[PDB]
Amino acid sequence: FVNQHLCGSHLVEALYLVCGERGFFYTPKA
Amino acid sequence: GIVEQCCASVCSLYQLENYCN
């Protein structure tokens, strides 16, 4: 479900599920 | 960035996992 165009809340939700308890960083400006 | 890699273009698990801590 990771192999598509993921934008905004949809990409943050994918980082959330794949990353799990490791956590992640969302830096949209580069 | 992640927007160019997964929003503007198609993403992969390989690249998503580069943003996990």
Side-chain angles (χ1 to χ4, degrees):
Chain A
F1 71 95
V2 298
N3 287 103
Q4 81 198 60
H5 282 274
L6 282 186
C7 299
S9 71
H10 304 195
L11 170 62
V12 165
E13 145 178 325
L15 273 177
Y16 175 72
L17 287 187
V18 157
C19 299
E21 35 159 50
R22 285 129 97 192
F24 51 93
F25 62 75
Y26 176 60
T27 40
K29 289 302 86 203
Chain B
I2 194 176
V3 174
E4 294 61 29
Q5 305 134 121
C6 290
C7 169
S9 195
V10 172
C11 207
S12 40
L13 171 71
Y14 186 96
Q15 267 182 122
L16 283 176
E17 279 183 327
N18 284 328
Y19 308 87
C20 285
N21 295 129

